[PDB]
Design a protein around this ligand. Structure first.
Ligand code: FES
Ligand SMILES: [K+]
Ligand SMILES: [Mg+2]
Ligand SMILES: [Mg+2]
Ligand SMILES: [Mg+2]
Ligand SMILES: [Mg+2]
Ligand SMILES: [Mg+2]
Ligand SMILES: [Mg+2]
Ligand SMILES: [Mg+2]
Ligand SMILES: [Mg+2]
Ligand SMILES: [Mg+2]
Ligand SMILES: [Mg+2]
Ligand SMILES: [Mg+2]
Ligand SMILES: [Mg+2]
Ligand SMILES: [Mg+2]
Ligand SMILES: [Mg+2]
Ligand SMILES: [Mg+2]
Ligand SMILES: [Mg+2]
Ligand SMILES: [Mg+2]
Lengths: 122, 48, 137, 72, 23, 97, 74, 128, 86
RNA sequence: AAACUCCAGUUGACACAAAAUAGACUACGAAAGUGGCUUUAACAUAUCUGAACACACAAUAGCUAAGACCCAAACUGGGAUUAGAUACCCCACUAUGCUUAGCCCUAAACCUCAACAGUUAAAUCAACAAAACUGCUCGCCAGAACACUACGAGCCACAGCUUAAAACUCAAAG
């Protein structure tokens, strides 16, 4: 199916960041993936201190990778990311654009519940 | 119709030949998914 | 400009300076308001112990330590040991819902120290370790 | 009634005008009611669409001197 | 509703479990 | 017979059903600027549908997106990102007074 | 209470009676004790308001049917 | 088992899909789909092979075929998840519901009862 | 621990008014629910007991929210008697 | 009081444990039960009822084997209270709670209110509770106690579970 790889790389120079992206995308193609795009969300400060591969990170580069791949290639790709030191954190999720949103009409009011107790003189 | 639309997009997919070129381009652009909303249900995208 | 109750963020420069110092350089007063005691410890921005006081160190024993008098007495003793080192403005960090949660803050004001901010660091787990069983008293 | 569809649209397009109702007077005609009479009279002519028929009704009142301030 | 009929069965079971442990 | 009798008709004056501010919009876990509009500036706690004003179907989407962005490294847990403190307030809660 | 004065006047004008006040228990079923053994009860009762001030039926509606008195009601 | 290169049930019929790019044919295959798309094709094969009118799906025959594809799916899921007691109950009930279909079919149309038992490899066993 | 310090549950003092700040801080924790949550987490509340309390707290909210809706609906009749004497 | 005092506080590093807020939502599942994130597989039946001759499940506790161990904690020890306290309160610690492979098969397993279909009128209706009824089917109950017992039989269960009486006794029990 169609997946999305939320990748958080390490704060590195451009020469090293390009080698990691290419290294990471070649791993997807080797497992039967069909990459579609490579979006960059920019280098920002992490919401909290992340510790990975005996390193305390405070900044990182956010990159997205939309691609198609079989179901059996997800588990094999999650292991590769773990070994890579440059990758602080990487997770795969089903692409949100492959989930049609049912049209909504509006909020339906709910009337108070009636006939919960017998109409007897207590 | 879906197949035809897909047959056009496949040209833009990354490949081993154009992999290096696409990487550099991504390092030059930026995508912003951040946008707020008001009480009137109106999107407010940041001026950046 | 206006006044905001939100503290200044280190990343963003601010115009609020106390005695020519930034919000980050201000020393910190860690208060631990327990149910039977109240410890106070003042530190600098670089985590350097300046003064330490507690209801026990002031002479109170057993149940008399879990009062607002012993907490205030401990705040005055911590504000007198830190004022000798050049401490005027502090950032309070309370931890716990004990009796001396507010009374200790008063003793610091009665020792010549000015409180610019109040931070709550009470430990709440998001689940965590299972507490002891409920009492029948 | 059949004219309730007309009133619902008039109040939405224009809304109750400055003129205040006089419920005491039995033979009282409101600005909206006057709009219904014309709207229906033009329907007798043969127009079969609401949009054109609705628009033509407002013009007739404006010619008669009625004040029709739309919400916009 | 009271538990007087549960209390009769409570002692019956307790005395029986205590008698088996003894024999 | 008579023509003044009422007719079997649906209510013309009935008003359209109300919609939440997010009706028809896509909630994504990367839009931290939108997700921070529904958390406490001080504790980072998620607000309820009686404060946000959202419907059940959309309040569940904001929650699942916040919990996903917090553990992925996009959004903080204990506090609201100061960068989004000057954003339009859509929640019906007043702390100071 | 809004129409208590109006009704009391009408009864006086038409030479009839009115009871617009709090209805004490036994005005009809226990009348002989309240008024006297030779008292004469109404032959017709007219209810201009069949409800009391708590939005419940007036007690006289039931007490009149007990004493076989016909009632007229709005 | 349908090969992975097989196209989806929906996309095989559209015209012009015979001459397209190889990448577009690999995205519309069973390789880039879930397990439930391969089962929609397994069912299609049995209908043409066994049922007289493939289009009709409400007939007692088709219901047996639709259910026999689910039974095989549960056995492949239980071969890897032995401690999944939920799917082990759906299997034993589905096997009992198919037997109730085969009983009503053997009592009405014995000519087709033999066809389904042969096509799907089923052996009706009289209960003890 | 891993988050930035002095950004959560922090309140600044205005004109050395510590009292007004402490009341504000204690009102933010109460409205968010931390205060009550910290008190129940002192001793372990077993599931059965926690499910009995949530049902009690939810039935109290309903009743208290409907009575107040009737008080504000009848407060309009708290005026003087217009038919004084009848 | 005892205990601790290679303790306490600030900071940093740091889980095979447990899963704030959202939830004022009321969803999923046959029930048990299920509320941190991601992915994979995946939630029977085109009439209904239907197995206490069978099959598959079944909270917690507990048994067997191998591991993990922050915290909690039967047992036990100490302190205190008490006429005594084998308890209620305080401290410490163990089995156990977790993982894996098997067993055990119990509950106020109760929303004590069976499944399918259908009704709101008549006598609505002992009382209380969560208003009163129809059709059809399966299951179950026939005074209290003896009795979640004895015997018999079956079961990886051996101080066990399931099925389950009798004699004597009472004029009440409920
Ligand atoms: S009302 Fe349409 S999505 Fe909330
Ligand atoms: K119950
Ligand atoms: Mg009672
Ligand atoms: Mg007994
Ligand atoms: Mg059945
Ligand atoms: Mg059964
Ligand atoms: Mg069990
Ligand atoms: Mg165990
Ligand atoms: Mg312990
Ligand atoms: Mg002892
Ligand atoms: Mg242990
Ligand atoms: Mg346990
Ligand atoms: Mg239960
Ligand atoms: Mg029962
Ligand atoms: Mg049944
Ligand atoms: Mg009996
Ligand atoms: Mg038992
Ligand atoms: Mg037995
Ligand atoms: Mg035996």
């Amino acid at each position: 199916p169609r997946y999305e790889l939320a990748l958080i790389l390490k704060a590195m120079q451009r020469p090293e960041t390009a080698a990691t992206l290419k290294r990471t995308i070649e791993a997807l193609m080797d497992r039967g993936a069909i990459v579609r795009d490579l979006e960059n969300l920019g280098e920002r400060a992490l919401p909290y201190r992340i510790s990975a591969h005996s390193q305390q990170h405070n900044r990182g580069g956010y990159f997205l990778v939309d691609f198609y791949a079989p179901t059996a290639a997800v588990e094999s790709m999650v292991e590769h990311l773990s070994r890579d030191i440059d990758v602080i954190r990487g997770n795969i999720v089903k692409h949100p654009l492959t989930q049609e949103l049912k049209e909504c009409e509006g909020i339906v009011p709910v009337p108070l519940a009636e006939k919960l107790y017998s109409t007897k003189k207590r | 119709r879906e197949v035809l639309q897909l047959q056009e997009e496949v040209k833009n997919f990354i490949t081993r030949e154009n992999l290096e070129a696409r990487v550099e381009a991504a390092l030059d652009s930026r995508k912003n998914y951040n946008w707020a909303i008001t009480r009137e249900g109106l999107v407010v995208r940041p001026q950046r | 400009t206006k006044f905001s109750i939100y503290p200044p963020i280190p990343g963003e420069e601010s115009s609020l300076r106390w005695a020519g110092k930034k919000f980050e350089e201000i020393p910190i007063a860690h208060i631990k308001a327990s149910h039977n005691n109240t410890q106070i410890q003042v530190v600098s921005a670089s985590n350097e112990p300046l003064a330490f006081a507690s209801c026990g160190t002031e002479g109170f024993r057993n149940a008399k330590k879990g009062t607002g008098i012993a907490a205030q007495t401990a705040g005055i003793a911590a504000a007198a040991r830190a004022k000798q080192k050049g401490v005027i403005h502090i950032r309070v960090v309370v931890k716990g819902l004990g009796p001396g949660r507010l009374s200790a803050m008063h003793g610091l004001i009665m020792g010549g120290l000015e409180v610019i901010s109040i931070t709550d660091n009470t430990p709440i787990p998001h689940x965590g370790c299972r507490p002891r069983k409920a009492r029948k008293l | 009634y059949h004219e309730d569809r007309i009133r619902a649209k008039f109040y939405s397009v224009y809304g109750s005008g400055q003129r205040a109702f006089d419920l005491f007077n039995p033979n009282f005609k409101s600005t909206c009611q006057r709009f219904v009479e014309k709207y229906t009279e033009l329907q007798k002519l043969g127009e079969t669409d609401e949009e054109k028929l609705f628009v033509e009704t407002g013009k007739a009142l404006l010619a008669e001197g009625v004040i029709l301030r739309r919400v916009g | 509703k009271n538990v007087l009929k549960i209390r009769r069965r409570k002692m019956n079971h307790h005395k029986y479990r205590k008698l088996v442990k003894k024999t | 017979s008579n023509e003044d009798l009422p007719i079997s008709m649906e209510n013309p004056y009935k008003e359209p059903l109300k919609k939440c501010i997010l009706c028809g919009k896509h909630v994504d876990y990367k839009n931290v600027q939108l997700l921070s509009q529904f958390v406490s500036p001080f504790t980072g706690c998620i607000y309820g549908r009686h404060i946000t004003g959202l419907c059940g179907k959309k309040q569940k989407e904001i929650t699942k997106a916040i919990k996903r962005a917090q553990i992925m490294g996009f959004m903080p847990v204990t506090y609201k990102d100061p960068a989004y403190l000057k954003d339009p307030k859509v929640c019906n809660i007043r702390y100071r007074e | 209470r809004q129409f208590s004065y109006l009704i009391e006047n009408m009864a006086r004008d038409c030479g009839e009676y009115a009871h617009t006040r709090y209805f004490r228990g036994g005005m009809l079923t226990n009348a002989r004790l309240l008024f006297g053994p030779t008292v004469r009860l109404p032959d017709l009762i007219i209810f201009l308001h069949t409800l009391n001030n708590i939005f419940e039926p007036h007690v006289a509606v039931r007490d009149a049917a007990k004493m076989n008195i016909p009632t007229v009601g709005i | 088992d349908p090969p992975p290169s097989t196209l989806l049930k929906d996309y095989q019929n559209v015209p012009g899909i015979e001459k397209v790019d190889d990448v577009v044919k690999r995205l519309l295959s069973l390789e880039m789909a879930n397990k439930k798309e391969m089962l929609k094709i397994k069912q299609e094969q049995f209908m043409k092979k066994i049922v007289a009118n493939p289009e009709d799906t409400r007939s007692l025959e088709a219901r047996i075929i639709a259910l026999s594809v689910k039974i095989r799916s549960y056995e492949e899921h239980l071969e890897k998840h032995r401690k999944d007691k939920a799917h082990k109950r759906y299997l034993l009930m589905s096997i009992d519901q198919r037997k109730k279909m085969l009983k009503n079919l053997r009592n009405t149309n014995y000519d087709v009862f033999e066809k389904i038992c042969w096509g799907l490899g089923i052996e009706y066993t009289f209960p003890p | 621990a891993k988050h930035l310090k002095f950004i959560a549950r922090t309140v600044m003092v205005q004109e050395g008014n510590v009292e007004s700040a402490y009341r504000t801080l204690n009102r933010i924790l109460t409205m968010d629910g931390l205060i009550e949550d910290i008190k129940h987490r002192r001793y372990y509340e077993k599931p059965c007991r926690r499910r009995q309390r949530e049902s009690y707290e939810r039935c109290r909210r309903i009743y208290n929210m409907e009575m107040a809706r009737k008080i504000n609906f009848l407060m309009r009749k708290n005026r003087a008697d217009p038919w004084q004497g009848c």
